[PDB]
Amino acid sequence: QGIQQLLQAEKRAAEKVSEARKRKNRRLKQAKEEAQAEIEQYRLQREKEFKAKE
């Protein structure tokens, strides 16, 4: 029992820290994509302000 369940917990531990080396790297790519969705809405808002002034 004991060492087998401990090695399974060690395998889960190794997987959990391996996923931590990936989590924020996916968010760091998506930062480049969220920085397009934010930008088109702002470009549209600034054009609407300009067109209202025109």
Binding site: G2, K16, V17, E19, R46
Partner: protein, 49 residues
């Protein structure tokens, strides 16, 4: 029994600690990359209109 489950929780904690450290050290880089691009483009677009 309890000592086995304690060691299992300990070896997963021995990853949880690294995992929190890795999440926290990388947390800033995602925030910087979004903020950098957002400020850069919102300044250009402000001045254009």
């Amino acid at each position: 029994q309890k000592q086995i489950k304690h060691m299992m929780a300990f070896i997963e904690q021995e990853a949880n600690e690294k995992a929190e450290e890795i999440d926290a050290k990388a947390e800033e880089e995602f925030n910087i990359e979004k903020g950098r691009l957002v400020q850069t483009q919102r300044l250009k677009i402000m001045e254009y209109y």
